[PDB]
Design an enzyme around this catalytic site. Structure first.
Site, PDB file in Angstrom:
ATOM      1  CG  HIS A   1      -1.933   1.113   1.206  1.00 31.48           C
ATOM      2  ND1 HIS A   1      -1.673   2.357   1.740  1.00 31.48           N
ATOM      3  CD2 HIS A   1      -3.199   1.166   0.730  1.00 31.48           C
ATOM      4  CE1 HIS A   1      -2.735   3.128   1.593  1.00 31.48           C
ATOM      5  NE2 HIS A   1      -3.675   2.430   0.983  1.00 31.48           N
ATOM      6  N   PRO A   2       0.584   2.239  -0.850  1.00 32.15           N
ATOM      7  CG  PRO A   2       0.278   3.111  -2.965  1.00 32.15           C
ATOM      8  CD  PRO A   2      -0.374   2.210  -1.966  1.00 32.15           C
TER       9      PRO A   2
ATOM     10  CG  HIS B   1      -1.441  11.770  -3.554  1.00 28.03           C
ATOM     11  ND1 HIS B   1      -1.445  11.203  -2.297  1.00 28.03           N
ATOM     12  CD2 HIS B   1      -2.617  12.431  -3.671  1.00 28.03           C
ATOM     13  CE1 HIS B   1      -2.572  11.515  -1.681  1.00 28.03           C
ATOM     14  NE2 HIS B   1      -3.298  12.263  -2.492  1.00 28.03           N
ATOM     15  CD  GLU B   2       1.324   8.204  -0.664  1.00 29.40           C
ATOM     16  OE1 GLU B   2       1.629   8.599   0.480  1.00 29.40           O
ATOM     17  OE2 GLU B   2       0.223   7.673  -0.922  1.00 29.40           O
TER      18      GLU B   2
ATOM     19  CD1 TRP C   1     -27.660   4.712   3.648  1.00 23.87           C
ATOM     20  CD2 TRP C   1     -27.722   2.841   2.420  1.00 23.87           C
ATOM     21  NE1 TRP C   1     -26.425   4.551   3.068  1.00 23.87           N
ATOM     22  CE2 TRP C   1     -26.437   3.409   2.309  1.00 23.87           C
ATOM     23  CE3 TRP C   1     -27.997   1.654   1.733  1.00 23.87           C
ATOM     24  CZ2 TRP C   1     -25.428   2.830   1.541  1.00 23.87           C
ATOM     25  CZ3 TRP C   1     -26.994   1.081   0.970  1.00 23.87           C
ATOM     26  CH2 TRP C   1     -25.726   1.669   0.880  1.00 23.87           C
TER      27      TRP C   1
ATOM     28  CG  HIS D   1     -13.359   4.532   4.330  1.00 23.92           C
ATOM     29  ND1 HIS D   1     -13.614   4.091   3.049  1.00 23.92           N
ATOM     30  CD2 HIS D   1     -12.094   5.015   4.317  1.00 23.92           C
ATOM     31  CE1 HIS D   1     -12.553   4.307   2.292  1.00 23.92           C
ATOM     32  NE2 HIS D   1     -11.617   4.867   3.036  1.00 23.92           N
TER      33      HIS D   1
ATOM     34  CE1 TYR E   1     -10.520   9.343   1.682  1.00 24.13           C
ATOM     35  CE2 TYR E   1     -12.583   8.408   2.465  1.00 24.13           C
ATOM     36  CZ  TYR E   1     -11.205   8.364   2.366  1.00 24.13           C
ATOM     37  OH  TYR E   1     -10.503   7.336   2.952  1.00 24.13           O
TER      38      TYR E   1
END
Ligand SMILES: *[C@@H]1O[C@H](CO)[C@@H](O)[C@H](O)[C@H]1NC(C)=O
Ligand SMILES: *[C@@H]1O[C@H](CO)[C@@H](O)[C@H](O)[C@H]1NC(C)=O
Ligand SMILES: *[C@@H]1O[C@H](CO)[C@@H](O)[C@H](O)[C@H]1NC(C)=O
Ligand SMILES: *[C@@H]1O[C@H](CO)[C@@H](O)[C@H](O)[C@H]1NC(C)=O
Ligand SMILES: *[C@@H]1O[C@H](CO)[C@@H](O)[C@H](O)[C@H]1NC(C)=O
Ligand SMILES: *[C@@H]1O[C@H](CO)[C@@H](O)[C@H](O)[C@H]1NC(C)=O
EC number: 3.4.17.23
Lengths: 595, 99
Positions: free
Chosen positions: A327-328, A356-357, A459, A487, A497
């Site tokens: 995983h990054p 991005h990282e 929902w 999540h 997000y």
């Protein structure tokens, strides 16, 4: 002599001890993540236990200082961050039961295997196989079988767990002087005590509504266009007036629409802007990819990488004998130690992810002069936003012509701009109503607005009303269909997000007017512009010491979030979607007419 | 953990002053009585150096040279570079300050 000087001395001793214990914990987690071996596992467990006991005893000593006689905002912010009970405010039995519930949700989600009936000799897991069968298959009943089987099994094994989970988290938040757990999650955006920049916990939801009211027309046009393309994919099952079937969104849950680029292409005959062939012909290894990202970051004016970054980061998969997490992840180990955990493949996507990282690492690098408990983003959106703006700028054709990946004789016509913008819309605009729906459902179920026996009906109605997606079959309260996402099952905030998506385009407009770009926003590059880098680094240097409203006013001039940059980014795509939706019907109906 | 710095003191140091005391710092109104409990801290903290820290956190060895002049005869002089000796010619000689 006063309480405030006691708080300053206590915070200095806490920061000194904390940076060392944090470094030991982070280095143990790093040694586990780059080397999955059982002694690294027990070292990480020991360091985590020491770290958690350290923050337990320092919060115990920190709650003896009342905040109402402290006038300095930084000391007040550090003590407010330190004095948070978390799960410790409960009794030990209820706290242990809450951690047991969270651990068994983690083990159910991680080891959830769902396979075909009458073929049990082996079965297929979610992360290797179900993502691939959701993103790649074109069979309607196969996707329906996988979707219904996973949601049925996971819902029946997770519904009483979530039933106890909402009650335990509600008791935790009401013991922590919060209204609900949704208020506890909205408390990350809370700003108190600063005149003009004050932001309440309660205002954010109508603010999200105020942004979503202008989100909704563009998404509707995109939804109609996606429906038209799915009409090309599925002839009879989808209705022109109704919503999308749920198992056709390209992912397991409908979070991202980026897997529909093959199905929903505007101009399939035109090539893409994939530069993988240029990397593999010229033999662009991962080290020089990160060197090019460092060249981009010194082009914008930010400081270059440390020597220990190049020494200690593992930017390549080590081999078969040593197992590592693929995983990054960007790691801020503390004491000026910054690393990237990334198993780089030679692709354009890993290039953008490396940018991005490294944006994450630059954000962590800038607030190193701050005290330890303020070494974070001003809110949860900024940290990912400052990496996503680099992912925006590095993906432009101008930057790829600058670094030699794209030929100088490349013709940039409007068709490749339309299909690139549609890929960005399926990645970015598609996740916004799902995120707002999920967070607003979680806010009402923590608030108690939704009754306990009416969850799925409410929902699915919101999925009809917000996202414009209809269920295949009705589901009763024996099922728990929200909890199949990563999540919500592992106690993670989801509005980060949405805020990241808004702050991304806000920062992009602020940098592109800072860098004097004279064209449309999607063509813009922040390279070779020192003033835009200085304007951004003014926000990166603050960390969590200032309110996020003040940091936003430092970048874009507006304390509150704004939705105008996102629609300004997608403006020619919006005009194109208005042009080609004349025959089709924009908008949806909440009836079950497709299925 | 063999390197320590003093994090707390009741007053700033005078120039060229060395404070090697390990007395418990009085941060609160109550007396500390030698026990490092609430609002009483050990004034000396440890620099925990590791070979993987950045340039701002790597250990730096510092030597400070202070030069002082006193009424006593100054006896610490620099090295006096000597030119090779030339003979049988009329030259300017400087022998031990005699010119
Ligand atoms: C990873 O762990 C194994 C287990 O002992 C060890 O032999 C190996 O040297 C480690 N890898 C590195 C790069 O230290
Ligand atoms: C708050 O405390 C910091 C030390 O952590 C200090 O630098 C700053 O000047 C103080 N601000 C005010 C307004 O006293
Ligand atoms: C944390 O929990 C303790 C124990 O119930 C309580 O005394 C304290 O007030 C709590 N902290 C806050 C900030 O409410
Ligand atoms: C970073 O840049 C400075 C000056 O621009 C240079 O002296 C230093 O060697 C560079 N470091 C790396 C790792 O490239
Ligand atoms: C691109 O521009 C040309 C030139 O006017 C036009 O004919 C064409 O329809 C445009 N295509 C799109 C997709 O906007
Ligand atoms: C930015 O500067 C670098 C270094 O001089 C140069 O190679 C690159 O072409 C520049 N980019 C642009 C768009 O001018």
């Amino acid at each position: 002599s006063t309480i405030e000087e006691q708080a300053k001395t206590f915070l200095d001793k806490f920061n000194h001890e904390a940076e060392d214990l944090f470094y030991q914990s982070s280095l143990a987690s790093w040694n586990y993540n780059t080397n999955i071996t059982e002694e690294n596992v027990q070292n990480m467990n020991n360091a985590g236990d020491k770290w958690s006991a350290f923050l337990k005893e320092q919060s115990t000593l920190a709650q003896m200082y009342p905040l109402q006689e402290i006038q300095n905002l930084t000391v007040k912010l550090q003590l407010q961050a330190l004095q948070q009970n978390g799960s410790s405010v409960l009794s030990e039995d209820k706290s242990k039961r809450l951690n047991t519930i969270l651990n068994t949700m983690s083990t159910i989600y991680s080891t959830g295997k769902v396979c075909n009936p009458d073929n049990p000799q082996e079965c297929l897991l979610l992360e290797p196989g179900l993502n691939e069968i959701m993103a790649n298959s074109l069979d309607y009943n196969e996707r329906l079988w996988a979707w219904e089987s996973w949601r049925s099994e996971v819902g029946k094994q997770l519904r009483p767990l979530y039933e106890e989970y909402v009650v335990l988290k509600n008791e935790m938040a009401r013991a922590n002087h919060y209204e609900d757990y949704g208020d506890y999650w909205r408390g990350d955006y809370e700003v108190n005590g600063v005149d003009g920049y004050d932001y309440s916990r309660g205002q954010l939801i109508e603010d999200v509504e105020h942004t979503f009211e202008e989100i909704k027309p563009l998404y509707e046009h995109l939804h109609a266009y996606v429906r038209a393309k799915l009409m090309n994919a599925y002839p009879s099952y989808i209705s022109p007036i109704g919503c999308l079937p749920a198992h056709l969104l390209g992912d397991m849950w409908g979070r991202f629409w980026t897997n529909l680029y093959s199905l929903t292409v505007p101009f399939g005959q035109k090539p893409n802007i994939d530069v993988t062939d240029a990397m593999v012909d010229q033999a662009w290894d991962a080290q020089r990819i990160f060197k090019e990202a460092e060249k981009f970051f010194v082009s914008v004016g930010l400081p270059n990488m440390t020597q220990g970054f190049w020494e200690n980061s593992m930017l390549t998969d080590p081999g078969n004998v040593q197992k590592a997490v693929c995983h990054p992840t960007a790691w801020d180990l503390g004491k000026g130690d910054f690393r990237i955990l990334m198993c780089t493949k030679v692709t354009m996507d890993d290039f953008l992810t490396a940018h991005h990282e490294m944006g994450h690492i630059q954000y962590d690098m800038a607030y190193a002069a701050q005290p330890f408990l303020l070494r974070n983003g001003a809110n949860e959106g900024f940290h990912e936003a400052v990496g996503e703006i680099m992912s925006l700028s590095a993906a432009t054709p101008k930057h790829l012509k600058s670094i030699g990946l794209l030929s100088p004789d490349f013709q940039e016509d409007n068709e490749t701009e339309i299909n690139f913008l549609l890929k960005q819309a399926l990645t970015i605009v598609g996740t916004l109503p799902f995120t707002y729906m999920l967070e607003k459902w979680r806010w009402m179920v923590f608030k108690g607005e939704i009754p306990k026996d009416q969850w799925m009906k409410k929902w699915w109605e919101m999925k009809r009303e917000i996202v414009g997606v209809v269920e295949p079959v009705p589901h009763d309260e024996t099922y728990c269909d929200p909890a199949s996402l990563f999540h919500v099952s592992n106690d993670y905030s989801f509005i980060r997000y949405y805020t990241r998506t808004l702050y991304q385009f806000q920062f992009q407009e602020a940098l592109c007017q800072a860098a004097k770009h004279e064209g449309p926003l999607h063509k813009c590059d922040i390279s070779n512009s020192t003033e835009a880098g200085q304007k951004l680094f003014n926000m990166l240097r603050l960390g969590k010491s200032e309110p996020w409203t003040l940091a936003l006013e430092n970048v874009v001039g507006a304390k509150n979030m704004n939705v105008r940059p996102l629609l300004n980014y997608f403006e020619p795509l919006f005009t194109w979607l208005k042009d080609q939706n004349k025959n089709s019907f924009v908008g949806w109906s909440t009836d079950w007419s497709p299925y | 953990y063999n390197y320590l710095y003093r994090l707390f003191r009741k007053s700033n140091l005078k120039p060229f002053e060395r404070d090697i005391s390990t007395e418990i710092y009085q941060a609160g109104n109550k007396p500390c009585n030698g026990v490092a409990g609430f609002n009483c801290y050990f004034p000396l903290r440890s620099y925990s150096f590791r070979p993987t820290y950045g340039v701002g956190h790597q250990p730096y060895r510092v030597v400070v040279l202070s030069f002082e002049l006193l009424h006593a005869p100054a006896t610490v002089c620099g090295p006096k570079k000597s030119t090779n000796l030339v003979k049988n010619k009329c030259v300017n000689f400087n022998f031990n300050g005699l010119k």
